[PDB]
Amino acid sequence: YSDNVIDIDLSEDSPENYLLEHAVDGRMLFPATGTLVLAWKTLAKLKGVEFEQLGVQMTNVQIHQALFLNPGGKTTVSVSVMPITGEFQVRDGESLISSGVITSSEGRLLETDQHMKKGSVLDGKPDKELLFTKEIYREFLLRGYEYGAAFQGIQRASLDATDTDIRWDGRWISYLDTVLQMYLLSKPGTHQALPTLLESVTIDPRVHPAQPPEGTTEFQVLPGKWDPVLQIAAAGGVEIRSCHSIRASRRLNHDPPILEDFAFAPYVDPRPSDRSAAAVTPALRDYADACFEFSRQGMKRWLENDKNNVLPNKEEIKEALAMANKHANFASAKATLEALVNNKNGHRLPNHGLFEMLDIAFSEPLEGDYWDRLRMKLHDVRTYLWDDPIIAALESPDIVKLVMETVSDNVNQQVMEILEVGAARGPYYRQAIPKALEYFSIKDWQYTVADQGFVEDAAEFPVKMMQFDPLDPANFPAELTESCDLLVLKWNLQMQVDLDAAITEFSKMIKPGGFLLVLENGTRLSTFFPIKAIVSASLGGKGGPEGDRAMGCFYTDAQWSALFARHGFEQIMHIPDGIAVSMFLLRKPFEPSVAPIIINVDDLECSWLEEVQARCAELQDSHKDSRLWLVANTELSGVLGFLRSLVWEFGSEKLRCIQIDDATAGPNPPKISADSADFKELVRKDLAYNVFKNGKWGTYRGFVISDADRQKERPSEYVYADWLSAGDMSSLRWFDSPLKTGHNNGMLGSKMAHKLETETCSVYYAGLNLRDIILANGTIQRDILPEETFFKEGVLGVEFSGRNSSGKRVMGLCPPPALATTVKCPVSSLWSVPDQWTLEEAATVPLAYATAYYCLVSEGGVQKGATVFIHAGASVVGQASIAVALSYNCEIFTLTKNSDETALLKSMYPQLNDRNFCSSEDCSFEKYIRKETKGSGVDVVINTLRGKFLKASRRLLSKKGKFVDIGFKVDSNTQIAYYTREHPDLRFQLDALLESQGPEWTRLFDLVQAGIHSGVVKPLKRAVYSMDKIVDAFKTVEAEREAGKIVIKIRDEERQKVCPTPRTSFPAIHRTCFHPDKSHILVGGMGGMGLETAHWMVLRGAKKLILTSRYGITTGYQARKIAFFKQLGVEVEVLALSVNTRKAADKVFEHALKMGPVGGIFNMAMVLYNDDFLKMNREQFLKPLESKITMTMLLDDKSREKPVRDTLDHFVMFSSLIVSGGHLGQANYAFGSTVLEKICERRKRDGLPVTTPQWASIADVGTVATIICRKYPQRFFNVLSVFDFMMSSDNVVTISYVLVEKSMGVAAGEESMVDQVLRAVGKVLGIKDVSSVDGDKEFIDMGVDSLMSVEIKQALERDAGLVISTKDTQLMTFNTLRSMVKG
Ligand SMILES: NC(=O)C1=CN([C@@H]2O[C@H](COP(=O)(O)OP(=O)(O)OC[C@H]3O[C@@H](n4cnc5c(N)ncnc54)[C@H](OP(=O)(O)O)[C@@H]3O)[C@@H](O)[C@H]2O)C=CC1
């Protein structure tokens, strides 16, 4: 000698550790079939039998939450099976994780006879007609389902996935999941579907084979079958009937990718159009002038009002006015600058810092204790100068990265040593680290700050503090000699009395081949002086041959150059920010002792491989002064990426580059040839990469693209409303609409059967219904809508009012998205606006009355004089129902929230009296309605309320009475009724009718048309919201705080009645779309990236694909996907040829033009031979070069002639990060990739479309099928998210790579529970740094969805003792979050 507390041991060697091998987007969930084996093992205990000798049949199994497993942890769950009836729970405390009805039995329970099949039907088939375990679980991985070797049961399957071979290893949770995978494998797609309701599961172990013999290694495989007629996935002694799932937002396993623009930047004196030029916008120029005037007059007032003579450096102050007037009221100065500050015209500098401290240094009363007193006030607002547009113009992320990386390319060590002497006055770590150094992956860095004392602001940075006087040479610690590769001198070499002595000592600290970074004032030297004399104590700087220091510290920019040049310093970069400070990157000259060796690389046929190979072999045998110079005087040449890869195996101490771009070379092309003039200048600087482009020497650098630029809005003619993140109403934006191509996305599958006639109408007003709010806020997934909308771009908006193609005014309902600026409305759904309604009023009529007629006349069959009960009389559907019922001469009973709604309805309908209204707050209407109707009941009920109001409404139904239920938020039991066909689902019927537009719709169309003519259909009261307030409008609909219709105003109605709509553009976010009438060539599109991106193009509009591969279809994965595209309605064609000759190119474009005009050319072909450079012969060096040189050039040629030039829209050439960072062994691949990018850059020069993605590592599909160069591989769904941005952008080459960290690895100190949960809860929301976000912003404002709310609530229980409700996690901030744990 409740009913079962079951514990799952997730330990190192526990038998249930395999449950960790079942994840979904990194998170580890408890399988949906684990609640069946838990109820089946609890009924067996209840019946006193072994669980493997009991035959059960679970029905209507539901899953309400998801247990979140955890490595090395114990999770408990309580099952409870009701003895007689058979109702079971899997409760996990007070929260339900699953439910259903388990009912054991003895007779036969299995419906399908698969339990008798013995052998496998997938025998003797070719390998191209079969899917193996590698290919089956590549498809699941793409959708987020990550299964380990334990859950990888399906060992083989057919192309249609009907027949499979399932491994039987004796683990039932694993086995059942491998049978549920059959249902998953039968619904190809790209979204992540989470099972929620298994209608009928039948497990019969009596017919199942026995447990495998102990120690077995060759587990037997049972045949499996999928039955689409009945939706039964049967295998062995298991049968899972109809299952249902819900789309779930895919979560990013890693941190967001780092997008960059691989662009050329000049070294010295960049022009305003160059990327290394200081970002001095006209507004900043005005501020610089504005601050100059305020400083100057404040300088003069200082002189006059200093009657106490308590102003130090007064002689220096006087000199400032002398220079200020030479290089040229106080209240007006404040007025002008204050106007600049207080203005909010969009053109607004990030902050106005220099003025504020100048004001603080001028507004201070001139009394005793001035010098020391004011020193403290400004030292308190020192940050204002540091973060100030005027100063942060030579420290913009572009320039800082250029300095740090260009130094890194030339430093021939593994650790980059930096030294910022004088980090207390002018800090550079706060800019160098977050903007340039944190992105380093191939090279390590070691920052070291130094000043007189402790640098307080450097406490939080990964720098090393050092104590030594910076402004006193001859005492600099001798241990600093040859200690740094880079020496930063931000506002330091101006405060040393003898700068001639200053750098002489500094030049000894730099390593041989090191650099000096110098940032000093060089212009408008009277602007920053008011706040310099009063800080600096010994303002006694001595002059020199270059002149006399301005005031006593500064040297003019042209005189800084003279000093360094005189002392033997080569200017590497001299970016002369023209407003104030100027930059100087200097390196000591290199004097070679052996003649450098130049080798021409121009040839694209690699006729130079042998010469380069021999010299490269002689590198590590010569002087330290021997250098190999690979040169090239052509735009098309892969020297820049080729050298990067050679350095990865030979070191950067002997390899140099020179490339001259002929197209952009200036009037005087550099004549680099052995003993030349220009060449000798390069040898002295000794820069690893020298590129002559746009007329100046420079280098290629990856400039970061801010996260805000990915959502930058640009004008677009056709736009539509969608959500950036599902389930968020605050994420609604306007995207580019596919209607710019003429057609509408989603013409695949069912939508291809109904060939409706459509009219292209220009939307003027769009009405918002409660159907849109229910979809936007995540209350209902987009899968509940008719299946014709599955592939549509959006699902928001149905009704509208605008002008058809002829200029006539119209209104009507169309399949979504009608919340756009152009719609293709079927001609059978278009009414005409009578010439008395404004288009604003017509936007309120169509759906409200179409639903009202459907409910009353079409579904309830209302008759004259019948009684009707309408819920929510104040709603737009409710107001329409009252109007229609009144026209039918009925007795109306309505529910109103408050008295204001009653007042509105009585005024709107004078017929209604107070007797016809009730209260929606409590269920007292049932008594009143039954009494007032004398017990006969109501003939029709239009029901929207739920719970006890729904039951009460049904009980008022007459003997014939009809119940029309149009509520959206149905209960789980009600939803199962819809699935079971027990009840009809009428809440998405207007949507269903509009897709078909059959006899049932035409009845409503005629009804509403007659209603308009007879005066019953009248416009409703409305509130108009501008397009940009779309988010605000949606919230107002959801709140239901006031009665009325909400219509978004797209355009302005013209005074005429038949007039063309003017062409105008709307701000919108990018959304790439492909013309369905054009043919897209995907060269090498049968690979891993090509097949999964071709799917992406199909969803976005493409319907004519030509996939070319060297061999054609050769595997079961390729044959299955091609079959999927063709079934959808795509006109695919696989060509088994290689485009390496003109004839092959002609063939490809003969087939392409046969399908239709060419509208896209992609090249994802790749053959890679990895080996050591010195062990490559020519035949092996040009292996990758065929697909990346011999292919792109031929494709480029055909994309320049007619008719391809005019019709072509996209020209994508996939590249690799090897061109930007280099890699070991793939020297040939680097040469091929670099030439490919130089071809793409040429196209951009001629104005042709071009896009060159540069990926680092792609996870789900590709050659990876983990951490390379400290770079994580991207999930493919994220690749296509940034790929979309790449196409809709102006740059040519974009770099996308995911960084493991910026040092997190081996770095942490969390301890208190009050912080342990924060990182967990912060991680759940996808916030890498919890403290970064606001401590008062509600979680729903961040976009807290469900599953993400479930995890937070479950995480609190698992991590602490808190038990909260999901209703609070969406209104429960970070500050209140931290309070609960402590309590
Ligand atoms: N880790 C990654 O996945 C990365 C990918 N990239 C780029 O992505 C692109 C594709 O990646 P992936 O798809 O994984 O490469 P795969 O090797 O996965 O597939 C490459 C495809 O190229 C096709 N191909 C090769 N040569 C030719 C040719 N001469 N004519 C026609 N087709 C050809 C092959 O078809 P067959 O097999 O029939 O010859 C093969 O299916 C490549 O260009 C690569 O540079 C960039 C960075 C990293």
Ligand SMILES: *P(=O)(O)OCC(C)(C)[C@@H](O)C(=O)NCCC(=O)NCCSC(C)=O
């Ligand atoms: P919101 O949309 O309210 O979230 C509802 C959720 C939590 C998703 C719930 O309805 C649900 O279905 N939870 C997940 C069920 C589950 O256990 N799935 C995992 C096993 S199946 C597998 C392939 O993931």
